[model samples]
Each structure stands twice: as structure tokens, then as C-alpha cells.
Target: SPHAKYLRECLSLAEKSPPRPTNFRVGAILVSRKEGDYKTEDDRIVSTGYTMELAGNTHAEQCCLSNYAAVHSVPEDRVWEVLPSEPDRKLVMYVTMEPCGKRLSGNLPCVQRIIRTRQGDRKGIQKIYFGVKEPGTFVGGSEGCQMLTAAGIDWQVVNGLEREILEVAVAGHENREEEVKAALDT
Candidate 1:
């Protein structure tokens, strides 16, 4: 129930994201889950973020990561270098949809950002939970779960929230003929 509650927050936050034709309206939150057990309510959220929260092309996870950096008085661009090398709490990120495995923008993908965190060792996010595997509305398939597995990180696609999450996520492109083609169609 807590997972659903928290993921609902992600969905609500995602609704505020710019509905671009090529972007998904997604959300994420970073939490400290110290109990390390599934049957506990010990999770405490540190920050929440949505797609496009920082810049035009920013992603949900990136927004949360940047929020973490800001909370620790670290500059936005200096997330890995300025934060504590190792933290006292186990960090986890929950999202409305799966993280990107790769991208067309050539910028580092969300999966890689997370992988780099694990490898770079500054508050590596140990777990990832999401509502849906990426629908490939903007990108192709996702190897996010595979990559996370290979990197020794934990990930899961939480069930029961799919219908709504997918409904909102598809809004990024789903009935955009009016806005995206405002002039051409009219």
C-alpha cells in the first residue's frame, strides 16, 4: 500500500510535466529505505521530481538526483563530486515509469546515470521500482531491468498501477493532434 501511495505521488507529479510529443510525463521520488525489508513501512522520502522539472529536456530521475544535490548544498552540476562519497542511508528511487536504457539525444541515459552512481559511489541508488516498463512512445525497447540486474542493483515493475500510469504517460503523445498540429490540422 505504501508503494502505491508513493507511486501515486509520482503520478500526480508527472501530470504537471510538459506533454511534449516526444516525451513522457513521468515522475520520481528518492526515498531512504533503511529497513531493507519488503514488509515494512520504514521508507522516508527525501525528494520528489517530475519530468522537465529542471530544464526542457530533463527526466524525472534526474530531477530527483538534482534535488538531492541541492539538499546537500551541492551545485546542480556537481552531484557526484560534491556529495558524500558514501551515505548512511540506503537510497531507493520510485518512478511512474521505467528508466531509460539509452536515448537519441546522446546525453547520458537515466540507466547510465544510475549505473554511474553505483560505479562512481556517491550515494548510489540501490533500488528502483516503477509502474510500467517503458512503452517506447519516444524510445525503442528498454534494457533497464537487465542493466540494473547486471549492475547488481535491484529493480521491479510494481503492478496494479499500470492502467492509470500508462494512461497519463501516453498523454505525452496520445491525443496531441490538437496541440502539436494546431496549425497544420486546422
Candidate 2:
């Protein structure tokens, strides 16, 4: 039930996200293993974030990573490039949905960012745990898991939260669409 609690935290974070017309309501958390333990309770959260925190429409994972960079005096623009320097740390990312493999906006995908961040003998992120697998509603489709696998990243879908995450996404999409329609009608 620890995973359930952890995932529920992600959902609660998603609920607090500012609504974005063009993106899913997503949340992410970055957790670092304790100095000598990999136990769930020993994990220390490095950062937590939700979608659309910035004017340019950052994803939840991006926000979390950027926050980590900022706190560590690393440049926000190049967190991925700098993460390899900390090979002694092990990190795991918990996200509400599968990370995007491609972005319609042409930014580097979250999957690629995570991959590039680990592009050395020191893997910055040891694993990713997501709730919902992407359903191809976006232009990039659902290749995140496959890409992560190819890049040798360990990932898993937390067993019980998929339906809840998907439901939340669907509801957010419908609400945003209706809001758009109402604004256009006015």
C-alpha cells in the first residue's frame, strides 16, 4: 500500500495543478534513495511539481527537474546536461502519466530529457514509476515506455492507480474542452 499512498500523492498534486487548455493535468515527484537504503520509507523527495507552472507550458516532469536544477545551482536550461555529474545519487521519478516521447510543441520530450540526463556511466535516474500509460491522444502518441526500455531505464506502471489517473485526465480534458467552447460561444 505504500505505492498506493505514493501514487495518491501524485493525484492530489494533479488536483492542485492550474488547468491548461492544451495539456493534461499531470503531477510528478522526484525521489532520491537514502544514503544507504532503497526502502520506500527511506526515499527522500527531491521535488514535486505539476503541469503548467511556467508561462511556456512546462510538463510536470520538466517542472520537477527544473526545480531540482534551480535548487542545486544548475542552469534551468540544462538540467539534463548536468545531472550526470552526480553519479553517487540514485533517483526515481513518479509521474501521473507516461512521459511523452515526442512533443507537438517541438521541445525535447520528457523521455529524451531523462535519457540524456543519464547519458553516462552514472545514471542519474535509476527508475520511473508512472500511473497511466499514455493513450495516444497527443501528437507524439504512446512511445514513452518503449523508449525508456530501449534506453535501459527501469520503469513500471504502479498497479492500482491507472484507472484513477486516466479518469482524472479524461475529466480534465472534457472540462477544458467545454470551457473553450463556452468562451468561443460568448
Candidate 3:
């Protein structure tokens, strides 16, 4: 299936992300249904992004969304206002891990941002696909799928890539640990 192919690509993109000492190397892609077609094969990927692209960085999903906003003429500050203009447009996101349900940095949580897009009769994000459920240790964790359900958005877990995604995450974690240890030694 095209979605399977794209999901694999999502993992590949995650693998390519530059590892951060204290951040997860996550990846995300935003896709839209082709005009007049809702099939996976007809889906067009609008943007791709990875976590920590900068110092105090954006999440992978946030980066993709910001890029989508830029290309679609939704003003950076007025995203909520202009995003709902296209009621019939179908947008779906693919992420290596669950969207963050809480904001540790005081920024808007990804789950809330997505919900706002659906607020007031808007259908901004139609669905979400995730490779792994987030564990509960980080920043209030793992409530994204539940939040999406509460907001009436469709979401599904695709498990085939879990091992691959975890492997990449572990590799990053190990590398970071080694870096920290070396810094302390120095």
C-alpha cells in the first residue's frame, strides 16, 4: 500500500535526522488527499520534518505543520484563522511517535494545536498515523491519541515499524549518553 511505503519513508526520514544530545530524533510528514481522491496512492506529501532542527527546536510534527502553513498561505501567526478556509481539504499526518499532548516549553501542545484546527466546524486534520505510542516518562506523555479521539479526529497505530523506530531512537540515546559521559570525563 502507498501508506505503508510512505510510513517506511517516515522512518527513513527519522533515521536521517541529526541526533540531539537530549532530544528524540523524531520525524513527521504531512500529506493531503489528491483533489477528488482520498486513496493513499493519490495522497501528496506536503512536507517533512525532524525534531530539533535548531537549538531549542520544534518537534517534527510542528516543523512539518509550520512548513505546510507557509506553503499554503496560512500566516504564521494567523494559522488558526486561515487554516479552516478549505473545509473540504483532507490533511493527514504521519509521525514516528505520538504527538506531544503537553508542552514542556510552554508552547502550545501539538494535540491542542490540532484540536484548534478542528474547532468551530473546521476539519483541518482528518486523520493521524503514528508508528509508536509515546511512553509516559517524557513531558506528560502519550495522550495524543486519546486527545484526537476526544476531538473527533481519526487516528491509528501502525505497528510494523515500531522495531525500526525504536532501534533508531535507542541508537540516538546511546550516542547522546556517550557524548555526555565524554564531556563529564573531559
Candidate 4:
């Protein structure tokens, strides 16, 4: 319940992503469990990102993770395990859409990236919260949640944002009008 407000902010951030012809307009934010900084009251955000934020092909998680890494002076690929800002101050991810488990783009899957964050004694991401699950638009049979579970990473689907999240995520897809209609009809 307390996480709802942050998830709502993620929706607003998602709205900033331009509708892309080939991608969903996803948004992701990293927030520390303990307050390091704030705005809008109780807000503990450390980073924020949206899909296509770079190269028109980057994922929301990628941008958010990289931004945090760059800001913290940690290597991007090692952010999950070597983030100096964490441990006592764990980061919780709130994404408008599920982190992808597979990619046809040949880039590393977002889920795998999160999992890879766990190395040796280091925890990858502390937890994950998302607005909506995958829709199988690109991955066909996305199983990010299951993968996260199998990898021992906790995850939750925040309620009440499904319709809104889906609406924005598919804004750039083909047959978006029909899809949005079907979505609203549900």
C-alpha cells in the first residue's frame, strides 16, 4: 500500500516516453528503502528512466540502472553487485512494465541483467515492483516473474495500474488503436 504512490509516479514518468513504433514506453525508478533524498514528501527516489531514453532502443531499466551507475561511479554492468550506495540502503525498482526475460534485439535481457547483478555475496536489486505483467508482444512467452522467483529475487505486481500501464506501453505498437480499444473494453 505504501508503495502505491511511487508506482503512480512511475506512471507519470512513463507518460513522458514518446510513443515509439517499435517499443513500449516503459518507465522505471530506483528508490532507496531508507531516505537519502526526497521531493513530494516521503519520496526516496535515487534514479528515474523511461524507455527509448537513449539510442531510441534502450529499455527503461537500462537507462535507470546506467544513470544510477554513472552517478555513483560504478561500472554499468556491475551496478547490481557493486553499487556502493546500497547494502544498508537497498534499492527497490518500480517499473511500469515487467522487466523483460528475453529480447529479440539480441541485447541482454533485462531480467538477466537484474539476475546478473547478484554476484558472490552481493545482492543484485533488492526487490522489484511493477504495474503490469508482460503482454507477449515481443517475447511471445515472457516469464520474467518466474525467472526472478527462481533467482530468489522478490517481486510484486502493484495493483490498480494495469489499464493505464498497458495503454502507454503499447502506444507505439502496431494495431495500437485496436489493442487500446480491447484493453479499455476489458
Best by lDDT: 4
Judged by TM-score, which candidate is best? 4
Which RMSD values do the candidates have, in order? Answer: 5.7, 5.8, 6.0, 3.6
Using TM-score as the measure, what is the rank order of every candidate, best first?
4, 1, 2, 3
Residue-by-residue lDDT tens digits, candidate 2, 40-118: 7766787887776655768878887888788778886667655534434578888888888878777777887677677
| Candidate models: Cα lDDT each | 0.73, 0.71, 0.66, 0.75
Give per-residue CA lDDT, model 4, range 1-186, as digits (tens).
566787778878777878877777888888767534523354467788888776747788888888877877888886765553454566678887789888877777788877777787765576899877773236534488889899988898777877778878888788887876675465
Kindly report which residue stretches of model 2 are placed more than 4 angstroms away from their true locations once superposed. Answer: 34-37, 81-89, 135-137, 175-186
Model 4 residue 76 distance off true place after TM-score fit, in angstroms = 1.9
Q: Candidate 4 clashing pairs?
A: none
Summarize candidate 1's per-residue lDDT along 71-146 as a digit string, tens digits: 8887755666643333446778899888888777866678777766654546577889898776323664568778
Minimum summed lDDT over a 10-residue window in model 1 is located at 177-186
**Model 1: what TM-score?**
0.81
Worst 10-residue lDDT window, candidate 3: 177-186
Q: Give the per-residue lDDT digits (tens) of candidate 3, residues 1-186.
A: 465666788778777767644466677887877445456666666678777543465777776667667877886444555553354467787887778787657767677766766655556777888877772114434588788898798888786776666555445565645533432243
Instruction: Kindly indicate the candidate among 2 and 3 with the higher lDDT.
Output: 2
